[PDB]
Amino acid sequence: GSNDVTTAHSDYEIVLEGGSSSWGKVKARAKVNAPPASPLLPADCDVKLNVKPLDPAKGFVRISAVFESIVDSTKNKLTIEADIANETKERRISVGEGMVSVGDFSHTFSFEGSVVNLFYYRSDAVRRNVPNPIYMQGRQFHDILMKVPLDNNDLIDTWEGTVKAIGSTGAFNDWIRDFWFIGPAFTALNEGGQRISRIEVNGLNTESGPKGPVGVSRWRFSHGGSGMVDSISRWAELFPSDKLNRPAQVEAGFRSDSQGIEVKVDGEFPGVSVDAGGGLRRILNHPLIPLVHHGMVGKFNNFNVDAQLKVVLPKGYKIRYAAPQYRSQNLEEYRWSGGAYARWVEHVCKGGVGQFEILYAQ
Amino acid sequence: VTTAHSDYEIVLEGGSSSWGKVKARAKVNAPPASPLLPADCDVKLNVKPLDPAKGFVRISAVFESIVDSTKNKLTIEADIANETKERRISVGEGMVSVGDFSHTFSFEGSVVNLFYYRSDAVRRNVPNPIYMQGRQFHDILMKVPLDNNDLIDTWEGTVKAIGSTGAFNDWIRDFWFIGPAFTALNEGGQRISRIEVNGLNTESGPKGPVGVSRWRFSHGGSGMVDSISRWAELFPSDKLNRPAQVEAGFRSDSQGIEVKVDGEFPGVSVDAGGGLRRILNHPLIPLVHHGMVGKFNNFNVDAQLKVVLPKGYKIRYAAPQYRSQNLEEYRWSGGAYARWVEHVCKGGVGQFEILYAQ
Amino acid sequence: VTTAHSDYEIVLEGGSSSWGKVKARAKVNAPPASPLLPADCDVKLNVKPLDPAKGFVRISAVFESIVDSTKNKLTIEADIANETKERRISVGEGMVSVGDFSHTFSFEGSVVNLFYYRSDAVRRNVPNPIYMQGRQFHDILMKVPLDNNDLIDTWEGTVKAIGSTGAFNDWIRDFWFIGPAFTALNEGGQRISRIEVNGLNTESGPKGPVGVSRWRFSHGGSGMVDSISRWAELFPSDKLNRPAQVEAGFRSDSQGIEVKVDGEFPGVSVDAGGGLRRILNHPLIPLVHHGMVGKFNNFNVDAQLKVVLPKGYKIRYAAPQYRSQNLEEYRWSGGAYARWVEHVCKGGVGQFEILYAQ
Amino acid sequence: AKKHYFIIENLCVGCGLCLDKCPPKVNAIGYKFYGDVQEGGFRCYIDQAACISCSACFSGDECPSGALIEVLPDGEVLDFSYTPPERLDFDLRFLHRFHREA
Amino acid sequence: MSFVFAVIFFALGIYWWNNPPNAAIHLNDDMKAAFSVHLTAIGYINIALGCIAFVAFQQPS
Amino acid sequence: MQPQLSRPQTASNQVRKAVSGPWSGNAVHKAEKYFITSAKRDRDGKLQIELVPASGRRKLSPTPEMIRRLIDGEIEIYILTTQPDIAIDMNKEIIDMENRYVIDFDKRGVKWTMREIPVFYHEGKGLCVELHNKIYTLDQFFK
Numbered sequence A: 001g002s003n004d005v006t007t008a009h010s011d012y013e014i015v016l017e018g019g020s021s022s023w024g025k026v027k028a029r030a031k032v033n034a035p036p037a038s039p040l041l042p043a044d045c046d047v048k049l050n051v052k053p054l055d056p057a058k059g060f061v062r063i064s065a066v067f068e069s070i071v072d073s074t075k076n077k078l079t080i081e082a083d084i085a086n087e088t089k090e091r092r093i094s095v096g097e098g099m100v101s102v103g104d105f106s107h108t109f110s111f112e113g114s115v116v117n118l119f120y121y122r123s124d125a126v127r128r129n130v131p132n133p134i135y136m137q138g139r140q141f142h143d144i145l146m147k148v149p150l151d152n153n154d155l156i157d158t159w160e161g162t163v164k165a166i167g168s169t170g171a172f173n174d175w176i177r178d179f180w181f182i183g184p185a186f187t188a189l190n191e192g193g194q195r196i197s198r199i200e201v202n203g204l205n206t207e208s209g210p211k212g213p214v215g216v217s218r219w220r221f222s223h224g225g226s227g228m229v230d231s232i233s234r235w236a237e238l239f240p241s242d243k244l245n246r247p248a249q250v251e252a253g254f255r256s257d258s259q260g261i262e263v264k265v266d267g268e269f270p271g272v273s274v275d276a277g278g279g280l281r282r283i284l285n286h287p288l289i290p291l292v293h294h295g296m297v298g299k300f301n302n303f304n305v306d307a308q309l310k311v312v313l314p315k316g317y318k319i320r321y322a323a324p325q326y327r328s329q330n331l332e333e334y335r336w337s338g339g340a341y342a343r344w345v346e347h348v349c350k351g352g353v354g355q356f357e358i359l360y361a362q
Numbered sequence B, C: 001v002t003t004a005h006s007d008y009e010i011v012l013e014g015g016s017s018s019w020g021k022v023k024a025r026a027k028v029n030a031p032p033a034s035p036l037l038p039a040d041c042d043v044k045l046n047v048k049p050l051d052p053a054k055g056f057v058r059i060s061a062v063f064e065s066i067v068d069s070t071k072n073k074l075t076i077e078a079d080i081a082n083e084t085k086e087r088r089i090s091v092g093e094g095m096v097s098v099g100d101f102s103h104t105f106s107f108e109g110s111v112v113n114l115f116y117y118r119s120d121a122v123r124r125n126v127p128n129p130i131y132m133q134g135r136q137f138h139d140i141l142m143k144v145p146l147d148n149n150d151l152i153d154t155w156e157g158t159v160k161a162i163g164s165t166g167a168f169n170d171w172i173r174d175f176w177f178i179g180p181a182f183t184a185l186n187e188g189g190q191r192i193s194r195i196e197v198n199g200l201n202t203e204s205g206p207k208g209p210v211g212v213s214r215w216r217f218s219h220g221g222s223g224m225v226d227s228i229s230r231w232a233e234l235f236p237s238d239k240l241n242r243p244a245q246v247e248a249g250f251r252s253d254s255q256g257i258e259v260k261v262d263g264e265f266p267g268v269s270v271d272a273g274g275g276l277r278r279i280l281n282h283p284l285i286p287l288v289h290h291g292m293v294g295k296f297n298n299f300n301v302d303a304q305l306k307v308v309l310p311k312g313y314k315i316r317y318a319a320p321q322y323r324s325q326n327l328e329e330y331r332w333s334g335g336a337y338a339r340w341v342e343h344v345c346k347g348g349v350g351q352f353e354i355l356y357a358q
Numbered sequence D: 001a002k003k004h005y006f007i008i009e010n011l012c013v014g015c016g017l018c019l020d021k022c023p024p025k026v027n028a029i030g031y032k033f034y035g036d037v038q039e040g041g042f043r044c045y046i047d048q049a050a051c052i053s054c055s056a057c058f059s060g061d062e063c064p065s066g067a068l069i070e071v072l073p074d075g076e077v078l079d080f081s082y083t084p085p086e087r088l089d090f091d092l093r094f095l096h097r098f099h100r101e102a
Numbered sequence E: 001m002s003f004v005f006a007v008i009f010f011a012l013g014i015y016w017w018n019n020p021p022n023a024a025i026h027l028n029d030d031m032k033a034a035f036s037v038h039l040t041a042i043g044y045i046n047i048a049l050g051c052i053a054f055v056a057f058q059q060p061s
Numbered sequence F: 001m002q003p004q005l006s007r008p009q010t011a012s013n014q015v016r017k018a019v020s021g022p023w024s025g026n027a028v029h030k031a032e033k034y035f036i037t038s039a040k041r042d043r044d045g046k047l048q049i050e051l052v053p054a055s056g057r058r059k060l061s062p063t064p065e066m067i068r069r070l071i072d073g074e075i076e077i078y079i080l081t082t083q084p085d086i087a088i089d090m091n092k093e094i095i096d097m098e099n100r101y102v103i104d105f106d107k108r109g110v111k112w113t114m115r116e117i118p119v120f121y122h123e124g125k126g127l128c129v130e131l132h133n134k135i136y137t138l139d140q141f142f143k
Ligand code: BCL
Pocket: A049, A050, A051, A063, A064, A065, A080, A081, A082, A084, A092, A093, A094, A096, A112, A113, A114, A115, A140, A142, A143, A144, A223, A231, A232, A235, A238, A239, A248, A249, A250, A268, A269
């Protein structure tokens, strides 16, 4: 017969850019009438990501991200500012500063970061035989030099606890991963293929800065991926600095609740579409980690989600091989609703990675 | 179909007392995820304060079970007390019997729980902290008389394995977590460090040789681990002014689960600040562990919750909202409560906090 | 509606012959959890006894696939035998092809399985053991000819990686469990030790360089690992008196999965004592692995089972209970069997045992 | 007892709903006028010498201006028995069904 | 029309049994939320019934 | 709330952002209301100011972050002159100020008069309260 309904509603729109550009407007609204798996509720969050090109000489882009949230009447905020550039095809360098505030507490930070992405292989046989390689195993090597002014009495207490803990306990290098990934974050590491290696602390030295003591943390870590992680396998594709010819913004935010979740997403960025050969462009392959991360939190209420997707191709373009097939097309834009598409929407809301690819050409 | 019937009740006490009767029953028309069926189990946890002078409480636990027509039993006595805020000591003995086999054990173990940080910034800002990372360090001395042939064979095999196989320290974690226990370990955020065996020996006891095992292990959590995240909340020895007993069991055949649980223990209601008490935050390990087995069947639920407040106390901000207030007792049924019950049966850890004052 | 058609048929053999004709067709109207679509696969498994005096059996498995218009093939011929109760030796060879690329390979391997314990108190007091923890120590010597340019490129890349990087012994586990295979490692309770490389070298072969990789590793389980807990049961070399066949394969698109499985092999029903034969306890790793992909769409199940006993054999104590018997065969459909089928499709491992005898 | 309750003669509008819940045997709550009552010149007070810490005035949850406070025994000052959870809010409008944004 | 409405109501009841609709919030405090929503719905239905009576009772039928 | 939808002479101090504000927290307070609940002197001469919200769940301190949240028109701080860590004689200062315009019909309304006094932050001086035409500071001075 029937079951529990717990309906969920969601709309998605993709407005692509013409020519050879990979840009595209992405907005997604959603409403779920199911309790979230947050042990502290309500947990509201508002997110703003903005990137502007500093200079095309060596590919620095000015990226900022503001996470302002309230969880159980605790007003959380975390702002970052960073200048990230690809100095080569395998290594990324970032320098910037930010701050985090929770209730009364707040502390700023400035970080010099370098991320190096190594695939375990670069065999040409795979490249010339798999047109759409999804899984790509590799390692990311993070080297972070972050400086935090220890002005609050809690910051000095955190420093005193940490430097006393590192020298007194030899198991800090791996027990740091337990604190690092709080709650479900540690469990979500394995169900996404991530492996966090022991961090190497190159030294915790404190020195007086412009206004006082500045805790300096020079530490490296490397997280490995089974090809299941997007930050490793799709490392080049997630940083389209070469195709950023104008400022790109992504403003999102969710209103989590005791009996529901409300989601707004607004985006405008390059990399929405990639090539597939012979003038045939496709929407970018869906990132693996968000799907299989929401999956371990989105399988707690039986739901019959009704989702509508909107893809507005640029003038002169027509979709070829949309799978699942689009429900309707207004001669320039395509629309997905029900049928096999709603099944795929439930599939990916529960964590499935069923390939829903959209290819088009002029 | 596969409809889930369940009745929950909470009979609280007022004032400084945190005690509360918890009795629940549940009917599930779904096959349990046990490769050996049918499985029946009875558990009786009785606690009484030995000497309130410095924290001795005698906690007794009897686990009677029958799985695929083999009779299991596990009784364990333990005098558990807190030497300090972070250290606990347990002294006692026990017995485990499967079929016609039975070996009696005695132990003297100490558990030391250490939080990674004790920041006042988080404590003063977050009024209800759920995730709290840390480690416990189990230092256990367990003794078992070696009178059975099977016991002596186990002891000799273990001694030989530790002598020869150097990887025993981390290969014991495969044996020690039977089946899906190992997967549940990572699902709940737990992770075990390699054990360290401080010594194995045998000596002539009251009637024969006894296997004395001084071993140590430590497990750490990321915040869900309710043994670690809330160390003193799980062991309310200070507020145990009278004997506390819990009787639970389930009759789980091949086509359904028949849950029954009783309870009378302190710590049911905890102060949330501003003269506003609350039902203790729901433990996360049971929810995340049952979510692996509660996701195997689509089920309708008619769950009813009784919360009987003391004389004069009133619930403020019950969420999901209660259905019908009757004098001093409250009811939850259907709507958002049924959705939340399904959410926590399938694996969610959504908050259902019942704040109440007088 | 996401309806999942599925029919099952098992035709058993009389006497002590544990053989059985297994066929199964499935049609699931849900999108597969494959990041590349459409994906198809044709699997052929061939076995034949060549000399049972020393235990050799010749096994041939052929995998063919077309994933996202990429043609894949994996032929593996092997000569496997139980050297002892715990050791096996395989001297086999095969090839793998993707697109136009293809490299053949040969291997001489030795897998030894050790159980952590061999207690008699467990073997006799548990009528049907399921969870048996242990380790398997794979030892593989594969010689792969380096004929293609990409072959030698892989070879120098690998040897340079092992010489330079010291963490190759555990990052090979990250590379080696591509995609969600790494998660399925922990879902079934498996653990992989650091691989031990005993040497990588090449020699002037009959037609070109042959990169000989002599390596070993060891995977351990919590009892759920069928390759470990069912070491002897999964490889019925002794009771193979004729060639066995398994011709399975699935057709999968963006909007459904179609499965066609045919099989005939010994060990389908295992003895239970007193002339009582039971269908083998269901493989546990396949259930808990399909559970990671069977919980993505809510589905309505109409699954039918057909257990056909030979002449004179009758069933007893089936759970879930069958509906219709024809004096020679038994049938399951809907009812509690629907609950069990949804249970095992979503990853549940509840016992559905069938005891039949004469 | 502890956790004295008090009345702020800065939010109080003199409605006296706090006085309605004060036990008649203890005239803890009263009235001061100082002028016309049409301009809030009828504030209420709590006679801390007569108040016996009933919680009746505060736990009744009727003070409309949050003048009753119930300072906690240590230092904490409440304002109302329970306070909503201070949520971030936004208007959820869909893309091309139900709503169309714009 | 009683038979016609019997068929219509039976089909609609089947559909809403197998596809229950969601006003969501009326499920929890149906004592006052669903009750009041249905009370105002019945009020509008009753005004409509008054109008139907006024129009019909004056017709030649 | 929008200026064109509000009562004409409404300042930003009384104009509330978060357009659906009244149901997010207490409806009485447009901005989050904090109370100076204790000001103790320990070790050195500096005093520890304790900001407990009107919700009574936390126990905070002035802090640069909440100071910024104050000077951004998001929170408000009050002292509750009956505070036992007071320096000025508020009981005499309240009583002799009500004696100017209050007639004691009840003979005890002035005696038990307690009120809240707001706290503002300049910068050069810290959290300072302006009382009786004189600007006291919580740092020393007012306590
Ligand atoms: C998330 C998966 C991997 C990871 C993958 C990456 C990747 C990939 C990158 C870094 C990069 C950085 N990482 Mg790392 N890194 C991780 C965990 C960490 C942790 C930690 C405590 O866990 C730390 C301190 C760091 C530290 C850092 C700095 C060294 C560096 C720049 C930070 C910054 O600019 O913020 C940037 C963060 C944000 C702007 C917040 C939003 C984050 C999410 C992931 C962005 C979503 C983008 C959205 C889908 C589309 C946005 C489009 C709009 C145009 C913006 N990483 C996890 C383990 N890390 C960057 C680098 O290379 O520096 C050299 C980089 O490209």
